[PDB]
């Protein structure tokens, strides 16, 4: 009569046999691959043990947030540029965690081995936990931060700008629309293995250097769950390694997956890091190289070699398009500052010294331009000037990639400057690289997303902002700002007086 | 080093000074409530609602969405990431639903964790207190191992029926609820096995292998009709709403409730088995938890939608009748189990009042919500006919 | 009728005062000069289960802060 | 007024469908709308900014009428036109397997979506079709994806090259 | 103000720089383990041990003490604050004891907390599921309300018997175990009433007042000897070790176990009662948890003490015979209850076998550890005498 019990491993040892073979036991979603029915999972968990290991992580996280951190006034003693930067990093990442739920739900429906199914299911719940975790960061900074607007309504205000559309492409539609396996790669084999896992930790670093202790408390917890999701991505390539069709499609689905992801995070992450902070952590060119070229492309992809996985073919191309990519985009992002849900700042003297030192030649280009804008008054609402006007005057149109949705200006870009324009049955399409063009030519009905110019055509700037609640509680001052100082903030009237009217830059070829 | 090499802006004097110098005198907006633009279901907005509503990027074309434009990437063929085309049901807004229990991830795992820990403690006491001595040998080796153990596959099948829903649900509130329903289902399935594993540990002759209970499930006769129903709700249904609704407001609400509360929960105590009920109390607590969601979604939101009240109830009533049949076939076939029981376990007078308890409850909680004219006396009759 | 129901500490505490019964030897084992009133009430109405619940919640915040954020 | 979410043009379609009061009528308008405004092969991009939202409103009308019209069994196995849903699916699939190239397969799939997208065909059959059709279409395309050089591919797709630029 | 007026040394640049300036290069001692000098019971010192052993300021003149000198202030007359005079048992070191479950305050309230919350969810589902429908009316109103209820006063008495021990225990580890043994008892007594309160809410006419149960306890025949024993264990024993040993190693191990396990836990199911067993599970889990602590203190530490093993066993043997009789008498009177039950509920054989189960466990788990020569047939025979 000794005290006895049962743990997760003892139950899980029989989980594989919960599934029975029958005429209609197959996936409901389209696919080209065949996931083996004797595929096994790396972690032996049952619903109850999962819940426990996760509730223990929560105790720590929430205890710090509500007690010590709130007592130290952590949500305020942060640098202005970072407070803003977190409005984006947290909410954009949130949508990535949310679709990740549907993604793994679609995967749990694809696998046939009950164990593999139990693997995706565990991620379905983890992603739900992450959605609510990113949500909490925004929530916490609105309640106790130096500037709530944005942190409080990113879910609706983010729909005003163009940086949003591209995020949906990589962390929303890329995760759930296509062959289950293609989606798996976009999400796990690439999305998480190569970008989030490294990013999550990097974010806590930059956040810490800039006074933010809130973010590292949550993202460090999120981090503890990523190794299982990666194991899912690995086990995905294993469950189809034997299917003959694999040797015919795997590699092209991965290349397309890899390009889809770096095409947005390459310019966006580096941008948020270097221009959204005060104290720097590490030059982005160095970082990008370690993450993409060495860690992922080399090591992580080398282990799948025996399963017939080749390094991405578009890898070297990505590396050449990357050098100036993030610097080129901030110009477009700052010039379109009124369309965001956060306040942007121009580089101060210490930062300009930092950039030129890290990116030789940066000053003669971007620096001289920002200084021009500042003297003309881009920070002062009474100037009547916003950088967009400078692009128009100097004839520098800004396009939107029909596939990736990433904004690009081939006329001014110091990095990639290729441009391909086409017309098909009454509609025009603009492209920025050889890979996305193929994707469209080959799958035209998959990429029909309207860009901001198309949607806002003929519309006056201030009205679009008003219509989409881009204002602060007093319904007068704008959420977004051309500077992070506390006074002289722009209002809806300051914008109205500019009388700016969106136009479709592709009609110039008419 | 004792001081570490990393300098944190919150504690480094120099870096903190720059930070404080750049700060505004007061916050730049008095509105510090995240999700303030969400329509509250109760007196004042809750964390549940704030952390959840609108996490999903739906555009205005999917009832209630706040974004605009088509999706950025769709399926080969043009299939949208999410669309009205995935369900027959229609509504004014898919973000209307609200789990009455307000469960977001944190509270959900806190609860299932406390339960796990207590379950562990309960088993260590039961085995130490040698209570196994009072349990009937036949009920054990036969009805728990074979019959109750077979029922795990029925629960495992309902778990899997949720998969697609986990992908097509048109809103965050609905997605989370669905996720938790199915997750709780697989929980029960692993618990039925846990009980078998435990008995293998305290009863020298017990074999934990799922061979016996599975064989009974696959080629038996008592669960036959029940298994066909399961396979259909899972793999022959592609409509995520027809799935959640049919599985929870019909099949499990009738057959399921009967097999758990009217057969095992009722007869195990008579064979000196308080072990199996310890677990059934969890399944029933979960059942009663889910019901509140199913009800708010299909009745308070869709069934009584200010715009599609009629259309939905019609579709639901249609669905109800569609499955009320394979569900009655499941129950009828089940009755063949009472002939297995030792003489004198229970009479026909009891298993008649219990069937009415089940059906009558199903009517006041589900059927009358969509005005599906159900007849209690005909259903009981149809079922009983299976008593061998 | 079948509305979810339960019972809280105060409902149980309501009958706590009656838990003690009389018998000759029901007296304190320690020397004293005073006599403590037989019907003295207490301010807070707690029962073991609930007492554990409110102290554990306080424990969570404390150790959570200590082990996580403060340590970092 | 003008607007992203509310505009005169969208109000012109609410009243337009608000006048519909017959399943056969409302059903035909939907089938047409899908030919005139959705997919890369649409008859015009004149409504690109509102069609997605207008379609939903239209489906809304067809759906309700189809409920008050069809009887139990039908609403489950018939299309808003009266054709046997199962027949259609099985028929479209037979064709998909009967396709010589990806260019042919792509037309079958895209046409199918324009014709039988719910409330027309029952979701249960539609999504099962979307499961079978998508599979084959993908198998054909993804086969030797990078072979055809961009110049050639542009010709095959039949696109009008308006401008090429590359340093 | 956004920043506040209070300046904190950890974040205030000026104040923090001062602090960092005074910091030494590295720690002034590398022994960063509080309690490092405590003799480990297991492989490595535990958090439980570290945060507990030696909190009591005993001097060397109380076995195991680390301090010196008399107490600073004693009772009028000279009675020490703590002393060897408060108990017959002797030991080489009072700090030897270790709760096998290593329970310090934090873990303890955590576990009870989990139980409290699952108890609420269970009651909500039991009521919402309407399981009360299958419970026998006679069993509920007569045996649960009156007899189970009356048992609350028993568990309440054993709770109070710990009042002196909390004040007199000669060591921190024993005090903590002692505290938790008594706290689990009042919990159970309250849980019994909680059940009666519940029934009052779901069954109209069920009076939850403690009047009936209390009259049964103070004036009935069934629990007469039980009360007499509890009254004496609580108020007639001034030796704190006799109190804890006799309560947990004799009375509650024989009478308590029989009533909870061989009567209510065994018969309740036979009346469709899955409600009472729910709480009885908690009570047995607690009983079994206390057993490990009681065995470690009385058998492992005291009964097997290297210097007073034989002396202690003679004393515990003495106490055993002293309380065994009142415990047997308590069981005798209780047998009278079987007569109150409906015909054919149970028989003289089941009752006898069930009596041998409690005695055998007690002989195996307790009697045998101090070489107490108990005759099983003779004890059972003395009890059956109370069978009417
Ligand atoms: Ca290039
Ligand atoms: Ca008597
Ligand atoms: Ca007999
Ligand atoms: Fe995640
Ligand atoms: Fe992940
Ligand atoms: Xe991001
Ligand atoms: Xe970032
Ligand atoms: Xe703009
Ligand atoms: Xe503009
Ligand atoms: Xe969520």
Swiss-Prot record, chains B, E:
InterPro entries: Ferritin-like_SF, MethMoxA_beta, MP_mOase_hydro, Phenol_Hydrox, RNR-like. M.capsulatus has two forms of methane monooxygenase, a soluble and a membrane-bound type. The soluble type consists of four components (A to D): protein A, comprising three chains, in an alpha-2, beta-2, gamma-2 configuration, is a nonheme iron protein containing an unusual mu-hydroxo bridge structure at its active site and interacts with both oxygen and methane. Responsible for the initial oxygenation of methane to methanol in methanotrophs. It also catalyzes the monohydroxylation of a variety of unactivated alkenes, alicyclic, aromatic and heterocyclic compounds. It comes from Methylococcus capsulatus (strain ATCC 33009 / NCIMB 11132 / Bath). Its EC number is 1.14.13.25. It catalyses: methane + NADH + O2 + H(+) = methanol + NAD(+) + H2O; methane + NADPH + O2 + H(+) = methanol + NADP(+) + H2O. Keywords: Monooxygenase, NADP, One-carbon metabolism, Oxidoreductase. This is Methane monooxygenase component A beta chain. GO terms for molecular function: methane monooxygenase [NAD(P)H] activity. The keyword NADP applies. The lineage of its organism: Bacteria, Pseudomonadati, Pseudomonadota, Gammaproteobacteria, Methylococcales.
Swiss-Prot record, chain C:
It comes from the Bacteria. Responsible for the initial oxygenation of methane to methanol in methanotrophs. It also catalyzes the monohydroxylation of a variety of unactivated alkenes, alicyclic, aromatic and heterocyclic compounds. Belongs to the TmoA/XamoA family. M.capsulatus has two forms of methane monooxygenase, a soluble and a membrane-bound type. The soluble type consists of four components (A to D): protein A, comprising three chains, in an alpha-2, beta-2, gamma-2 configuration, is a nonheme iron protein containing an unusual mu-hydroxo bridge structure at its active site and interacts with both oxygen and methane. This is Methane monooxygenase component A alpha chain.
From Swiss-Prot, chain D:
GO terms for biological process: methane metabolic process; one-carbon metabolic process. Keywords: Monooxygenase, NADP, One-carbon metabolism, Oxidoreductase. It holds the Pfam family MeMO_Hyd_G. The keyword Endoplasmic reticulum does not apply. It catalyses: methane + NADH + O2 + H(+) = methanol + NAD(+) + H2O; methane + NADPH + O2 + H(+) = methanol + NADP(+) + H2O. It comes from the Bacteria. Its EC number is 1.14.13.25. It is an enzyme of class 1 (oxidoreductase). InterPro entries: Me_mOase_g, Me_mOase_g_dom1, Me_mOase_g_dom2, Me_mOase_sf_g, MethMoxGammaMmoZ. GO terms for molecular function: methane monooxygenase [NAD(P)H] activity. Responsible for the initial oxygenation of methane to methanol in methanotrophs. It also catalyzes the monohydroxylation of a variety of unactivated alkenes, alicyclic, aromatic and heterocyclic compounds. M.capsulatus has two forms of methane monooxygenase, a soluble and a membrane-bound type. The soluble type consists of four components (A to D): protein A, comprising three chains, in an alpha-2, beta-2, gamma-2 configuration, is a nonheme iron protein containing an unusual mu-hydroxo bridge structure at its active site and interacts with both oxygen and methane. This is Methane monooxygenase component A gamma chain. It comes from Methylococcus capsulatus (strain ATCC 33009 / NCIMB 11132 / Bath). The gene is mmoZ.
């Amino acid at each position: 009569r000794a005290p006895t019990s049962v743990n997760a491993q003892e139950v899980h040892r029989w989980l594989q046999s919960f599934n029975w073979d029958f005429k209609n036991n197959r996936t409901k979603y389209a696919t080209k691959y065949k996931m083996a029915n004797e595929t096994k999972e790396q972690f032996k968990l049952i619903a109850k043990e999962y819940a426990r290991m996760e509730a223990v992580k929560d105790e720590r996280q929430f205890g710090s947030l509500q007690d010590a951190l709130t007592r130290l006034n952590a949500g305020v003693r942060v640098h202005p540029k970072w407070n803003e930067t977190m409005k984006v990093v947290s909410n954009f990442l949130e949508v990535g965690e949310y679709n990740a739920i549907a993604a793994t739900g679609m995967l749990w429906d694809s696998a046939q081995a009950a164990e593999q199914k139990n693997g995706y299911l565990a991620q379905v719940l983890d992603e739900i936990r992450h959605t609510h975790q990113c949500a909490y960061v925004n929530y916490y900074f609105a309640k106790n931060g130096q500037d709530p607007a944005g942190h409080n309504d990113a879910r609706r205000t983010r729909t005003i700008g163009p940086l949003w559309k591209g995020m949906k492409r990589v962390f929303s539609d890329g995760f759930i629309s296509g062959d289950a396996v293609e989606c798996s790669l976009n999400l796990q084999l690439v999305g998480e293995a190569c970008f989030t896992n490294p990013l999550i930790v990097a974010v806590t670093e930059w956040a810490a250097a800039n006074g933010d202790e809130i973010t590292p408390t949550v993202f460090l917890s999120i981090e503890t769950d990523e190794l299982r999701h990666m194991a899912n991505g690995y086990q995905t390539v294993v469950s189809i390694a034997n299917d003959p069709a694999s040797a015919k499609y795997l590699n092209t689905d991965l290349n397309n997956a890899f390009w889809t992801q770096q095409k947005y995070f390459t310019p966006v992450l580096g941008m948020l890091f270097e221009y959204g902070s005060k104290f720097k952590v590490e030059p982005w060119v160095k970082t990008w190289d370690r993450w993409v070229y060495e860690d992922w492309g080399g090591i992580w992809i080398g282990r799948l070699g025996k399963y017939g996985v080749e390094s991405p073919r578009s890898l070297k191309d990505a590396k050449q398009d990357a050098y100036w990519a993030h610097h080129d985009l901030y110009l477009l992002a700052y010039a379109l500052w009124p369309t965001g849900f956060f306040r942007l700042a121009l580089p101060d003297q210490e930062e300009m010294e930092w950039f030129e030192a890290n990116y030789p030649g940066w000053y003669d280009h971007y620096g001289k331009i920002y200084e021009e804008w500042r003297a003309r008054g881009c920070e002062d609402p009474s100037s009547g000037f916003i950088p967009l006007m400078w692009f128009i005057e100097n004839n520098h149109p800004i396009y939107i990639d029909r596939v990736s949705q990433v904004p690009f200006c081939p006329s001014l870009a110091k990095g990639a400057s290729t441009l391909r324009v086409h017309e098909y049955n009454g509609e025009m399409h603009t492209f920025s690289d050889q890979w996305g063009e193929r994707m469209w030519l080959a799958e035209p009905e998959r990429y029909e997303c309207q860009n901001i110019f198309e949607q806002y055509e003929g519309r006056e700037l201030s009205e679009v902002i008003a219509e989409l609640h881009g204002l602060r509680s007093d319904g007068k001052t704008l959420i977004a700002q051309p500077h992070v100082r506390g006074d002289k903030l722009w209002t809806l009237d300051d914008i109205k007086r500019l009388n700016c009217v969106f136009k479709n830059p592709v009609k110039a070829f008419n | 080093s004792m001081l570490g090499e990393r300098r944190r802006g919150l504690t480094d004097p120099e870096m903190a000074a720059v930070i404080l110098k750049a700060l505004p005198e007061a916050p730049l907006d008095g509105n510090n409530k995240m999700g303030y633009f969400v329509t509250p279901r109760w007196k004042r907005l809750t964390e549940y609602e704030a952390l959840t509503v609108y996490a999903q990027p739906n555009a205005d074309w999917i009832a209630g969405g706040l974004d605009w434009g088509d999706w950025t990437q769709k399926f080969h063929g043009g299939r949208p990431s999410w669309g009205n085309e995935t369900t027959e049901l229609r509504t004014v807004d898919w973000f209307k639903h609200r789990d009455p229990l307000r469960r977001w991830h944190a509270p959900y795992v806190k609860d299932k964790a406390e339960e796990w820990r207590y379950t562990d403690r309960f088993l260590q006491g039961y085995s130490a207190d040698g209570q196994i001595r009072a349990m009937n040998p036949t009920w054990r080796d036969e009805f728990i191992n074979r019959y109750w153990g077979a029922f795990l596959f029925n629960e495992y099948g309902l778990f899997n029926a949720h998969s697609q829903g986990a992908r097509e649900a048109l809103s965050d509130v609905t997605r989370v609820s669905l996720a938790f329903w199915g997750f709780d289902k697989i929980d029960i399935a692993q618990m039925i096995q846990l009980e078998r594993g435990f008995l293998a540990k305290i009863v020298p002759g017990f074999d934990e292998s799922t061979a016996v209970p599975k064989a009974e499930w696959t080629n038996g006769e008592v669960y036959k009709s029940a298994r066909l129903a399961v396979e259909g709700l899972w793999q022959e249904v592609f409509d995520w709403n027809e799935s959640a609704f049919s599985v929870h407001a019909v099949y499990d609400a009738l057959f399921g409730q009967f097999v758990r509360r009217e057969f095992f929960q009722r007869l195990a105590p008579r064979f000196g088995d308080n072990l199996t009920p310890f677990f059934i109390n969890q399944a029933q607590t979960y059942f009663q938890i889910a019901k509140q969601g199913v009800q708010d979604l299909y009745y308070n939101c869709l069934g009584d939608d200010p715009e599609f009240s009629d259309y939905n109830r019609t579709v639901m009533r249609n669905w109800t009748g569609k499955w009320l049949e394979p569900t009655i076939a499941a129950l009828r076939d089940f009755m063949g189990l009472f002939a297995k029981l030792p003489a004198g376990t229970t009479d026909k007078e009891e298993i008649t009042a219990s069937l009415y308890r089940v059906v009558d409850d199903w009517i006041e909680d589900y059927a009358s919500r969509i005005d599906f004219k159900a007849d209690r006396d005909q259903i009981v009759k149809a079922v009983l006919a299976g008593l061998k | 009728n079948r509305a979810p129901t339960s019972v809280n500490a105060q409902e149980v505490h309501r009958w706590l005062q009656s838990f003690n019964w009389d018998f000759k030897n029901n007296r304190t084992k320690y020397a004293t000069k005073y006599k403590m009133a037989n019907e003295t009430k207490e301010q807070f109405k707690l029962i073991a289960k609930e007492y554990a619940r409110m102290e554990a919640v306080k424990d969570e915040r404390q150790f959570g802060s200590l082990q996580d954020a403060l340590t970092r | 007024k003008l607007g992203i979410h509310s505009n005169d043009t969208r109000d012109a379609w609410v009243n337009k469908i608000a006048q519909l009061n017959t399943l056969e009528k409302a059903a035909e308008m939907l089938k047409q709308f899908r030919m005139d405004h959705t997919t890369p092969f649409r008859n015009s991009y004149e409504l690109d900014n509102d069609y997605l939202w207008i379609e939903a409103k239209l489906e809304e009308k067809v759906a309700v009428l189809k409920a008050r019209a069809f009887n139990e069994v039908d609403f489950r196995h018939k299309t808003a036109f009266g054709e046997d849903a199962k027949s259609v699916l099985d028929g479209t699939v037979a064709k998909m397997n009967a396709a010589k190239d990806k260019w042919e397969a792509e037309k079958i799939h895209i046409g199918f979506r324009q014709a039988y997208k719910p409330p027309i065909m029952p979701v249960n059959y539609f999504l099962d079709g979307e499961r079978q059709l998508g599979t084959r279409l993908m198998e054909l395309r993804n086969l030797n994806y990078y072979d055809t050089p961009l110049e050639e591919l542009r010709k095959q797709r039949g696109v009008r090259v308006v401008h090429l630029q590359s340093p």
